[PDB]
């Protein structure tokens, strides 16, 4: 019942600049959350590493399908 | 090379003989080449078409 999609999604991003961009995302996320109601929303980073992770996942996705 | 010379003497001397030659040649190679082309197209997949799994059902 477990898809391999979540498996490779977990599996690709062990140590990566994807993980570096997650730390960048949490840095701008702490900037967003620890500052009450300004404009900047920390979303650019979210888009760009979810692109990065879906490409590295797409590199080896069709194995166990 | 005389096999091309005797081919010239048999089938390339006359005009209408040359036309009838290319008629028979184009028809036979049409048949056999379409068979070979479809064979190559099924060989390059062998498991993807509708025909084999439609008759194995």
């Amino acid at each position: 019942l477990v898809d391999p999609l979540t498996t490779v999604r977990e599996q690709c991003e062990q140590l990566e600049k994807c993980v570096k961009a997650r730390e960048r995302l949490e840095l701008c996320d702490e900037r967003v959350s620890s500052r009450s109601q300004t404009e900047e929303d920390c979303t650019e980073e979210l888009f760009d590493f979810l692109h990065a992770r879906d490409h590295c996942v797409a590199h080896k996705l069709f194995n166990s399908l | 090379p005389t096999l091309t010379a005797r081919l010239y003497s048999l089938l390339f001397r006359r005009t209408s003989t040359f036309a009838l030659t290319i008629v028979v040649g184009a028809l036979f190679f049409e048949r056999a080449f379409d068979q070979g082309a479809d064979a190559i197209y099924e060989h390059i997949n062998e498991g993807k078409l509708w025909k084999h799994i439609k008759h194995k059902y």
């Binding site: 500052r35 300004t38 900047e40 650019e44 | -």
Partner: protein, 75 residues
């Protein structure tokens, strides 16, 4: 324009040989390949400096697009 009253020529002998007794491709991979390399030598100095300048402007244009649509302020 008809065929025969074009000009006046004296003093010229033109030899030429039949198509059959000469071959199809005389020294094709022996002279034609230095031929095409010499032809490429005659042009690219004054063909490429448009195209690579276009190319760098293309890279810079996409660069300005991405860095000016994605802004990263201080907030």
């Amino acid at each position: 324009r008809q065929f025969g009253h074009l000009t006046r020529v004296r003093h010229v002998i033109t030899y030429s040989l039949s198509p059959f007794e000469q071959r199809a491709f005389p020294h094709y991979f022996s002279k034609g390949i230095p031929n095409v390399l010499r032809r490429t030598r005659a042009c690219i100095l004054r063909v490429a400096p448009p195209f690579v300048v276009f190319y760098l402007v293309y890279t810079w244009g996409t660069q300005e697009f991405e860095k000016s649509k994605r802004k990263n302020p201080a907030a």
